[PDB]
Amino acid sequence: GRVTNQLQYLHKVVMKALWKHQFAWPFRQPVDAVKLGLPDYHKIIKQPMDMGTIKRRLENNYYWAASECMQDFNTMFTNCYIYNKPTDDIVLMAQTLEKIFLQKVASMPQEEQ
Amino acid sequence: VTNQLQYLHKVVMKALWKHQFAWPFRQPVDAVKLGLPDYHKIIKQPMDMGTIKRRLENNYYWAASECMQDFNTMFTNCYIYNKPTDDIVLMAQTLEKIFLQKVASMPQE
Ligand SMILES: COc1cccc(-c2ccc(=O)n(C)c2)c1
Ligand SMILES: COc1cccc(-c2ccc(=O)n(C)c2)c1
């Protein structure tokens, strides 16, 4: 991978803000389908993603560009919306976090180093 | 007329509006036409590219983030309402990947 201004911003500004959020706790580690008793989870969601995986990826220089990291954030939120019932609280929690994500992405340093 | 909103109009909406998977998203969901009587019960804030495009043309938005939330609502409505295996979900995912790719290069300020 490599280090850019944008990947540093996604790590220190965007992820830090989302991580600490009161609705973040279900998203900080992989969904544990066994523990939650969701035997269909991995049959419906083919690309699991979580902020713990994204954080580790930013720290281990896995990403080559900001867009790749932003795609992982998007997969995490989309997985939640696709799997869960529209009425589930987790959907409202994902939407709240996703709004912060987009607000902070709009303020990201424009040209990548 | 911010730098960011011009980018969202000329780069993002330009790319998404003409995409081969855009046609289901170009106008509001017609629940009667599509036979979806539960659509307006499940989706409380309908959104579509027609509406976003109109809003960009009519200088409705005060910030880029507001236009970005409308795009996000349109995609999220699709993931929440539809079955995981429905083609429309793949089409939404494809458009949204382009949305995020282009937003990654949007100017600051
Ligand atoms: C401790 O972690 C938890 C606890 C409870 C639920 C979830 C959970 C369920 C469904 C879902 O889509 N996500 C993203 C998280 C995660
Ligand atoms: C002519 O317009 C069409 C045609 C077929 C499907 C949809 C459609 C269904 C469900 C849904 O969520 N969306 C966003 C679009 C729209």
PDB file of C-alpha atoms and ligand atoms in Angstrom:
ATOM      1  CA  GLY A   1       0.000   0.000   0.000  1.00  0.00           C
ATOM      2  CA  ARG A   2       1.023   3.645   0.725  1.00  0.00           C
ATOM      3  CA  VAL A   3       0.255   6.709   2.979  1.00  0.00           C
ATOM      4  CA  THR A   4      -1.639   9.749   1.509  1.00  0.00           C
ATOM      5  CA  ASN A   5      -3.051  12.957   3.131  1.00  0.00           C
ATOM      6  CA  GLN A   6      -6.569  11.527   2.340  1.00  0.00           C
ATOM      7  CA  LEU A   7      -5.968   8.060   3.961  1.00  0.00           C
ATOM      8  CA  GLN A   8      -4.498   9.893   7.051  1.00  0.00           C
ATOM      9  CA  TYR A   9      -7.676  12.132   7.096  1.00  0.00           C
ATOM     10  CA  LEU A  10      -9.958   9.027   6.718  1.00  0.00           C
ATOM     11  CA  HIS A  11      -8.001   7.455   9.667  1.00  0.00           C
ATOM     12  CA  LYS A  12      -7.521  10.427  12.094  1.00  0.00           C
ATOM     13  CA  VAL A  13     -10.635  12.600  11.257  1.00  0.00           C
ATOM     14  CA  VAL A  14     -13.380  10.298   9.770  1.00  0.00           C
ATOM     15  CA  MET A  15     -12.790   6.875  11.465  1.00  0.00           C
ATOM     16  CA  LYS A  16     -11.900   8.505  14.873  1.00  0.00           C
ATOM     17  CA  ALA A  17     -15.266  10.437  14.880  1.00  0.00           C
ATOM     18  CA  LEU A  18     -17.361   7.375  13.775  1.00  0.00           C
ATOM     19  CA  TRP A  19     -15.503   4.940  16.129  1.00  0.00           C
ATOM     20  CA  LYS A  20     -16.352   6.981  19.304  1.00  0.00           C
ATOM     21  CA  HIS A  21     -20.039   7.538  18.288  1.00  0.00           C
ATOM     22  CA  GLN A  22     -22.703   6.101  20.722  1.00  0.00           C
ATOM     23  CA  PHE A  23     -24.181   4.092  17.753  1.00  0.00           C
ATOM     24  CA  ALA A  24     -20.726   2.715  16.642  1.00  0.00           C
ATOM     25  CA  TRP A  25     -20.481  -0.365  18.989  1.00  0.00           C
ATOM     26  CA  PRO A  26     -22.217  -2.902  16.624  1.00  0.00           C
ATOM     27  CA  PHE A  27     -19.857  -1.845  13.730  1.00  0.00           C
ATOM     28  CA  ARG A  28     -16.421  -1.931  15.553  1.00  0.00           C
ATOM     29  CA  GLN A  29     -15.830  -5.715  14.908  1.00  0.00           C
ATOM     30  CA  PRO A  30     -17.036  -8.319  12.342  1.00  0.00           C
ATOM     31  CA  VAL A  31     -20.708  -9.417  12.744  1.00  0.00           C
ATOM     32  CA  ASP A  32     -20.526 -12.688  14.819  1.00  0.00           C
ATOM     33  CA  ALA A  33     -23.445 -14.649  13.217  1.00  0.00           C
ATOM     34  CA  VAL A  34     -23.032 -17.640  15.659  1.00  0.00           C
ATOM     35  CA  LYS A  35     -23.181 -15.400  18.817  1.00  0.00           C
ATOM     36  CA  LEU A  36     -26.098 -13.270  17.403  1.00  0.00           C
ATOM     37  CA  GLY A  37     -27.809 -16.465  16.060  1.00  0.00           C
ATOM     38  CA  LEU A  38     -28.000 -15.246  12.406  1.00  0.00           C
ATOM     39  CA  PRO A  39     -27.400 -18.486  10.420  1.00  0.00           C
ATOM     40  CA  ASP A  40     -28.467 -16.782   7.103  1.00  0.00           C
ATOM     41  CA  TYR A  41     -26.106 -13.751   7.602  1.00  0.00           C
ATOM     42  CA  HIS A  42     -23.133 -15.163   5.558  1.00  0.00           C
ATOM     43  CA  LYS A  43     -25.576 -16.643   2.935  1.00  0.00           C
ATOM     44  CA  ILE A  44     -26.979 -13.080   2.272  1.00  0.00           C
ATOM     45  CA  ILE A  45     -23.827 -10.941   2.968  1.00  0.00           C
ATOM     46  CA  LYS A  46     -20.913 -12.207   0.766  1.00  0.00           C
ATOM     47  CA  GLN A  47     -18.430  -9.368   1.676  1.00  0.00           C
ATOM     48  CA  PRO A  48     -18.550  -8.776   5.471  1.00  0.00           C
ATOM     49  CA  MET A  49     -17.013  -5.408   6.479  1.00  0.00           C
ATOM     50  CA  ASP A  50     -16.654  -3.528   9.805  1.00  0.00           C
ATOM     51  CA  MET A  51     -14.770  -0.422  11.118  1.00  0.00           C
ATOM     52  CA  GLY A  52     -12.248  -2.717  12.956  1.00  0.00           C
ATOM     53  CA  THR A  53     -11.158  -4.286   9.598  1.00  0.00           C
ATOM     54  CA  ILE A  54     -11.069  -0.764   7.956  1.00  0.00           C
ATOM     55  CA  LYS A  55      -9.051   0.689  10.913  1.00  0.00           C
ATOM     56  CA  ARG A  56      -6.484  -2.207  10.756  1.00  0.00           C
ATOM     57  CA  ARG A  57      -6.315  -1.724   6.922  1.00  0.00           C
ATOM     58  CA  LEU A  58      -5.574   2.046   7.334  1.00  0.00           C
ATOM     59  CA  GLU A  59      -2.914   1.211  10.038  1.00  0.00           C
ATOM     60  CA  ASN A  60      -1.240  -1.614   7.941  1.00  0.00           C
ATOM     61  CA  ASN A  61      -1.128   0.580   4.731  1.00  0.00           C
ATOM     62  CA  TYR A  62      -3.526  -1.834   2.872  1.00  0.00           C
ATOM     63  CA  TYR A  63      -5.203   0.973   0.816  1.00  0.00           C
ATOM     64  CA  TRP A  64      -3.571   2.544  -2.305  1.00  0.00           C
ATOM     65  CA  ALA A  65      -6.235   5.346  -2.575  1.00  0.00           C
ATOM     66  CA  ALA A  66      -8.952   7.078  -0.422  1.00  0.00           C
ATOM     67  CA  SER A  67     -11.742   5.741  -2.755  1.00  0.00           C
ATOM     68  CA  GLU A  68     -10.812   2.089  -1.816  1.00  0.00           C
ATOM     69  CA  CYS A  69     -11.274   2.899   1.924  1.00  0.00           C
ATOM     70  CA  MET A  70     -14.534   4.836   1.204  1.00  0.00           C
ATOM     71  CA  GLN A  71     -15.803   1.731  -0.724  1.00  0.00           C
ATOM     72  CA  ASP A  72     -15.156  -0.428   2.430  1.00  0.00           C
ATOM     73  CA  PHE A  73     -17.159   2.079   4.594  1.00  0.00           C
ATOM     74  CA  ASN A  74     -19.967   1.891   1.955  1.00  0.00           C
ATOM     75  CA  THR A  75     -19.961  -1.986   1.948  1.00  0.00           C
ATOM     76  CA  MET A  76     -20.268  -1.962   5.790  1.00  0.00           C
ATOM     77  CA  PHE A  77     -23.382   0.336   5.665  1.00  0.00           C
ATOM     78  CA  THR A  78     -24.953  -1.380   2.576  1.00  0.00           C
ATOM     79  CA  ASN A  79     -24.514  -4.875   4.226  1.00  0.00           C
ATOM     80  CA  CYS A  80     -26.531  -3.557   7.229  1.00  0.00           C
ATOM     81  CA  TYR A  81     -29.378  -2.117   5.016  1.00  0.00           C
ATOM     82  CA  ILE A  82     -29.547  -5.268   2.795  1.00  0.00           C
ATOM     83  CA  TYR A  83     -29.531  -7.897   5.627  1.00  0.00           C
ATOM     84  CA  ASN A  84     -31.634  -6.263   8.395  1.00  0.00           C
ATOM     85  CA  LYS A  85     -35.429  -5.554   8.527  1.00  0.00           C
ATOM     86  CA  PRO A  86     -36.244  -1.899   7.623  1.00  0.00           C
ATOM     87  CA  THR A  87     -37.716  -1.468  11.185  1.00  0.00           C
ATOM     88  CA  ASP A  88     -34.545  -2.719  13.042  1.00  0.00           C
ATOM     89  CA  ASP A  89     -32.752  -0.070  15.233  1.00  0.00           C
ATOM     90  CA  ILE A  90     -29.374  -1.141  13.650  1.00  0.00           C
ATOM     91  CA  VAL A  91     -30.629   0.434  10.343  1.00  0.00           C
ATOM     92  CA  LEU A  92     -31.222   3.845  12.048  1.00  0.00           C
ATOM     93  CA  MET A  93     -27.762   3.475  13.746  1.00  0.00           C
ATOM     94  CA  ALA A  94     -26.048   2.755  10.375  1.00  0.00           C
ATOM     95  CA  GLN A  95     -27.886   5.762   8.710  1.00  0.00           C
ATOM     96  CA  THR A  96     -26.715   8.147  11.531  1.00  0.00           C
ATOM     97  CA  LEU A  97     -23.054   6.966  11.169  1.00  0.00           C
ATOM     98  CA  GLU A  98     -23.279   7.098   7.340  1.00  0.00           C
ATOM     99  CA  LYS A  99     -24.489  10.781   7.437  1.00  0.00           C
ATOM    100  CA  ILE A 100     -21.341  11.708   9.518  1.00  0.00           C
ATOM    101  CA  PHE A 101     -19.163   9.687   7.077  1.00  0.00           C
ATOM    102  CA  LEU A 102     -20.530  11.705   4.071  1.00  0.00           C
ATOM    103  CA  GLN A 103     -20.310  15.085   5.933  1.00  0.00           C
ATOM    104  CA  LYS A 104     -16.604  14.392   6.807  1.00  0.00           C
ATOM    105  CA  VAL A 105     -15.810  12.953   3.287  1.00  0.00           C
ATOM    106  CA  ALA A 106     -17.121  16.290   1.804  1.00  0.00           C
ATOM    107  CA  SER A 107     -14.318  18.106   3.803  1.00  0.00           C
ATOM    108  CA  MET A 108     -11.502  15.654   2.787  1.00  0.00           C
ATOM    109  CA  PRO A 109      -8.323  17.278   1.303  1.00  0.00           C
ATOM    110  CA  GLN A 110      -9.203  17.293  -2.450  1.00  0.00           C
ATOM    111  CA  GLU A 111      -5.960  16.095  -4.213  1.00  0.00           C
ATOM    112  CA  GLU A 112      -4.327  12.848  -2.897  1.00  0.00           C
ATOM    113  CA  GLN A 113      -0.583  12.731  -1.881  1.00  0.00           C
TER     114      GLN A 113
ATOM    115  CA  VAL B   1     -23.152  28.082  -6.597  1.00  0.00           C
ATOM    116  CA  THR B   2     -20.203  26.469  -4.663  1.00  0.00           C
ATOM    117  CA  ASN B   3     -17.180  24.755  -6.371  1.00  0.00           C
ATOM    118  CA  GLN B   4     -18.360  21.428  -4.786  1.00  0.00           C
ATOM    119  CA  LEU B   5     -21.991  21.674  -6.075  1.00  0.00           C
ATOM    120  CA  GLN B   6     -20.684  22.431  -9.639  1.00  0.00           C
ATOM    121  CA  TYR B   7     -18.489  19.276  -9.322  1.00  0.00           C
ATOM    122  CA  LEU B   8     -21.563  17.245  -8.144  1.00  0.00           C
ATOM    123  CA  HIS B   9     -23.572  18.589 -11.165  1.00  0.00           C
ATOM    124  CA  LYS B  10     -20.894  18.405 -13.947  1.00  0.00           C
ATOM    125  CA  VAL B  11     -18.859  15.287 -12.845  1.00  0.00           C
ATOM    126  CA  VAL B  12     -21.091  13.139 -10.513  1.00  0.00           C
ATOM    127  CA  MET B  13     -24.682  13.639 -11.869  1.00  0.00           C
ATOM    128  CA  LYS B  14     -23.324  13.773 -15.496  1.00  0.00           C
ATOM    129  CA  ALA B  15     -21.678  10.299 -15.004  1.00  0.00           C
ATOM    130  CA  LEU B  16     -24.671   8.723 -13.141  1.00  0.00           C
ATOM    131  CA  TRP B  17     -27.551  10.217 -15.252  1.00  0.00           C
ATOM    132  CA  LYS B  18     -26.293   8.607 -18.541  1.00  0.00           C
ATOM    133  CA  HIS B  19     -25.184   5.242 -16.950  1.00  0.00           C
ATOM    134  CA  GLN B  20     -26.887   2.116 -18.430  1.00  0.00           C
ATOM    135  CA  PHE B  21     -28.214   1.155 -14.895  1.00  0.00           C
ATOM    136  CA  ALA B  22     -29.588   4.705 -14.154  1.00  0.00           C
ATOM    137  CA  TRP B  23     -33.070   4.298 -15.774  1.00  0.00           C
ATOM    138  CA  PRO B  24     -34.893   2.906 -12.625  1.00  0.00           C
ATOM    139  CA  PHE B  25     -33.529   5.896 -10.560  1.00  0.00           C
ATOM    140  CA  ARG B  26     -34.220   8.775 -13.074  1.00  0.00           C
ATOM    141  CA  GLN B  27     -37.817   9.387 -11.747  1.00  0.00           C
ATOM    142  CA  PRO B  28     -39.658   8.804  -8.429  1.00  0.00           C
ATOM    143  CA  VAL B  29     -40.627   5.161  -7.630  1.00  0.00           C
ATOM    144  CA  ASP B  30     -44.209   4.737  -9.021  1.00  0.00           C
ATOM    145  CA  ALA B  31     -45.687   2.265  -6.445  1.00  0.00           C
ATOM    146  CA  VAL B  32     -48.963   1.933  -8.499  1.00  0.00           C
ATOM    147  CA  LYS B  33     -47.102   1.267 -11.831  1.00  0.00           C
ATOM    148  CA  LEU B  34     -44.678  -1.193 -10.077  1.00  0.00           C
ATOM    149  CA  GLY B  35     -47.404  -2.825  -7.875  1.00  0.00           C
ATOM    150  CA  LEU B  36     -45.642  -1.943  -4.551  1.00  0.00           C
ATOM    151  CA  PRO B  37     -48.515  -0.870  -2.207  1.00  0.00           C
ATOM    152  CA  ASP B  38     -46.145  -1.117   0.860  1.00  0.00           C
ATOM    153  CA  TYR B  39     -43.421   1.109  -0.761  1.00  0.00           C
ATOM    154  CA  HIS B  40     -44.570   4.429   0.881  1.00  0.00           C
ATOM    155  CA  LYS B  41     -45.146   2.564   4.222  1.00  0.00           C
ATOM    156  CA  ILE B  42     -41.464   1.360   4.316  1.00  0.00           C
ATOM    157  CA  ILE B  43     -39.761   4.355   2.539  1.00  0.00           C
ATOM    158  CA  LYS B  44     -40.675   7.676   4.271  1.00  0.00           C
ATOM    159  CA  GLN B  45     -38.344   9.925   2.165  1.00  0.00           C
ATOM    160  CA  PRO B  46     -38.448   8.920  -1.533  1.00  0.00           C
ATOM    161  CA  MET B  47     -35.518  10.289  -3.593  1.00  0.00           C
ATOM    162  CA  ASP B  48     -34.433   9.938  -7.265  1.00  0.00           C
ATOM    163  CA  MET B  49     -31.848  11.411  -9.711  1.00  0.00           C
ATOM    164  CA  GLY B  50     -34.581  13.469 -11.495  1.00  0.00           C
ATOM    165  CA  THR B  51     -35.240  15.341  -8.203  1.00  0.00           C
ATOM    166  CA  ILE B  52     -31.458  15.692  -7.416  1.00  0.00           C
ATOM    167  CA  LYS B  53     -30.747  16.920 -11.036  1.00  0.00           C
ATOM    168  CA  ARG B  54     -33.662  19.456 -10.832  1.00  0.00           C
ATOM    169  CA  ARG B  55     -32.326  20.640  -7.393  1.00  0.00           C
ATOM    170  CA  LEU B  56     -28.753  21.065  -8.850  1.00  0.00           C
ATOM    171  CA  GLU B  57     -30.185  22.955 -11.923  1.00  0.00           C
ATOM    172  CA  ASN B  58     -32.404  25.224  -9.670  1.00  0.00           C
ATOM    173  CA  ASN B  59     -29.620  25.983  -7.051  1.00  0.00           C
ATOM    174  CA  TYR B  60     -31.752  24.303  -4.262  1.00  0.00           C
ATOM    175  CA  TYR B  61     -28.693  23.098  -2.229  1.00  0.00           C
ATOM    176  CA  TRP B  62     -26.747  25.339   0.237  1.00  0.00           C
ATOM    177  CA  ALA B  63     -23.879  22.768   0.650  1.00  0.00           C
ATOM    178  CA  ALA B  64     -22.396  19.703  -1.196  1.00  0.00           C
ATOM    179  CA  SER B  65     -23.163  17.487   1.891  1.00  0.00           C
ATOM    180  CA  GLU B  66     -26.973  18.116   1.360  1.00  0.00           C
ATOM    181  CA  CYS B  67     -26.811  16.911  -2.310  1.00  0.00           C
ATOM    182  CA  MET B  68     -24.617  13.962  -1.142  1.00  0.00           C
ATOM    183  CA  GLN B  69     -27.302  13.014   1.507  1.00  0.00           C
ATOM    184  CA  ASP B  70     -30.006  12.979  -1.290  1.00  0.00           C
ATOM    185  CA  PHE B  71     -27.838  10.550  -3.385  1.00  0.00           C
ATOM    186  CA  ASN B  72     -27.284   8.480  -0.182  1.00  0.00           C
ATOM    187  CA  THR B  73     -31.083   8.469   0.615  1.00  0.00           C
ATOM    188  CA  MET B  74     -31.854   7.268  -2.974  1.00  0.00           C
ATOM    189  CA  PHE B  75     -29.387   4.311  -2.686  1.00  0.00           C
ATOM    190  CA  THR B  76     -30.331   3.503   0.969  1.00  0.00           C
ATOM    191  CA  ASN B  77     -34.110   3.488   0.111  1.00  0.00           C
ATOM    192  CA  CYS B  78     -33.278   0.864  -2.554  1.00  0.00           C
ATOM    193  CA  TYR B  79     -31.218  -1.393  -0.156  1.00  0.00           C
ATOM    194  CA  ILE B  80     -33.856  -1.113   2.654  1.00  0.00           C
ATOM    195  CA  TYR B  81     -37.008  -1.789   0.528  1.00  0.00           C
ATOM    196  CA  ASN B  82     -35.846  -4.427  -2.014  1.00  0.00           C
ATOM    197  CA  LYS B  83     -34.948  -8.154  -1.572  1.00  0.00           C
ATOM    198  CA  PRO B  84     -31.139  -8.695  -1.320  1.00  0.00           C
ATOM    199  CA  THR B  85     -31.228 -10.770  -4.598  1.00  0.00           C
ATOM    200  CA  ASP B  86     -33.224  -8.181  -6.667  1.00  0.00           C
ATOM    201  CA  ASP B  87     -31.283  -6.881  -9.736  1.00  0.00           C
ATOM    202  CA  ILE B  88     -32.193  -3.248  -8.680  1.00  0.00           C
ATOM    203  CA  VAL B  89     -29.843  -3.696  -5.634  1.00  0.00           C
ATOM    204  CA  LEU B  90     -26.867  -4.599  -7.959  1.00  0.00           C
ATOM    205  CA  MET B  91     -27.735  -1.561 -10.164  1.00  0.00           C
ATOM    206  CA  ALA B  92     -27.842   0.741  -7.060  1.00  0.00           C
ATOM    207  CA  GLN B  93     -24.484  -0.726  -5.795  1.00  0.00           C
ATOM    208  CA  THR B  94     -22.858  -0.097  -9.260  1.00  0.00           C
ATOM    209  CA  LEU B  95     -24.075   3.567  -9.402  1.00  0.00           C
ATOM    210  CA  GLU B  96     -23.094   4.201  -5.741  1.00  0.00           C
ATOM    211  CA  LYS B  97     -19.514   2.870  -6.345  1.00  0.00           C
ATOM    212  CA  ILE B  98     -19.205   5.556  -9.138  1.00  0.00           C
ATOM    213  CA  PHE B  99     -20.779   8.170  -6.789  1.00  0.00           C
ATOM    214  CA  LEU B 100     -18.122   7.435  -4.079  1.00  0.00           C
ATOM    215  CA  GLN B 101     -15.213   7.196  -6.626  1.00  0.00           C
ATOM    216  CA  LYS B 102     -16.110  10.689  -8.006  1.00  0.00           C
ATOM    217  CA  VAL B 103     -16.853  12.185  -4.505  1.00  0.00           C
ATOM    218  CA  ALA B 104     -13.296  11.096  -3.415  1.00  0.00           C
ATOM    219  CA  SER B 105     -11.970  13.728  -5.964  1.00  0.00           C
ATOM    220  CA  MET B 106     -14.481  16.545  -5.143  1.00  0.00           C
ATOM    221  CA  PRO B 107     -12.772  19.883  -4.262  1.00  0.00           C
ATOM    222  CA  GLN B 108     -12.737  20.974  -0.557  1.00  0.00           C
ATOM    223  CA  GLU B 109     -14.472  24.249   0.616  1.00  0.00           C
TER     224      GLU B 109
HETATM  225  C1  LIG C   1     -21.488  -6.563  19.376  1.00  0.00           C
HETATM  226  O1  LIG C   1     -21.797  -6.420  17.991  1.00  0.00           O
HETATM  227  C2  LIG C   1     -23.118  -6.515  17.588  1.00  0.00           C
HETATM  228  C3  LIG C   1     -24.136  -6.741  18.491  1.00  0.00           C
HETATM  229  C4  LIG C   1     -25.439  -6.812  18.043  1.00  0.00           C
HETATM  230  C5  LIG C   1     -25.691  -6.671  16.693  1.00  0.00           C
HETATM  231  C6  LIG C   1     -24.677  -6.453  15.782  1.00  0.00           C
HETATM  232  C7  LIG C   1     -24.984  -6.323  14.351  1.00  0.00           C
HETATM  233  C8  LIG C   1     -26.108  -7.020  13.814  1.00  0.00           C
HETATM  234  C9  LIG C   1     -26.444  -6.906  12.529  1.00  0.00           C
HETATM  235  C10 LIG C   1     -25.674  -6.059  11.606  1.00  0.00           C
HETATM  236  O2  LIG C   1     -25.926  -5.902  10.408  1.00  0.00           O
HETATM  237  N1  LIG C   1     -24.582  -5.413  12.188  1.00  0.00           N
HETATM  238  C11 LIG C   1     -23.732  -4.544  11.375  1.00  0.00           C
HETATM  239  C12 LIG C   1     -24.257  -5.543  13.530  1.00  0.00           C
HETATM  240  C13 LIG C   1     -23.379  -6.372  16.238  1.00  0.00           C
HETATM  241  C1  LIG C   2     -39.331   2.819 -14.521  1.00  0.00           C
HETATM  242  O1  LIG C   2     -38.876   2.831 -13.172  1.00  0.00           O
HETATM  243  C2  LIG C   2     -38.628   1.626 -12.531  1.00  0.00           C
HETATM  244  C3  LIG C   2     -38.813   0.415 -13.170  1.00  0.00           C
HETATM  245  C4  LIG C   2     -38.551  -0.758 -12.491  1.00  0.00           C
HETATM  246  C5  LIG C   2     -38.115  -0.709 -11.175  1.00  0.00           C
HETATM  247  C6  LIG C   2     -37.926   0.501 -10.542  1.00  0.00           C
HETATM  248  C7  LIG C   2     -37.499   0.540  -9.146  1.00  0.00           C
HETATM  249  C8  LIG C   2     -38.011  -0.425  -8.222  1.00  0.00           C
HETATM  250  C9  LIG C   2     -37.672  -0.379  -6.936  1.00  0.00           C
HETATM  251  C10 LIG C   2     -36.756   0.650  -6.427  1.00  0.00           C
HETATM  252  O2  LIG C   2     -36.392   0.753  -5.266  1.00  0.00           O
HETATM  253  N1  LIG C   2     -36.288   1.552  -7.388  1.00  0.00           N
HETATM  254  C11 LIG C   2     -35.390   2.640  -7.004  1.00  0.00           C
HETATM  255  C12 LIG C   2     -36.667   1.492  -8.710  1.00  0.00           C
HETATM  256  C13 LIG C   2     -38.183   1.679 -11.226  1.00  0.00           C
END
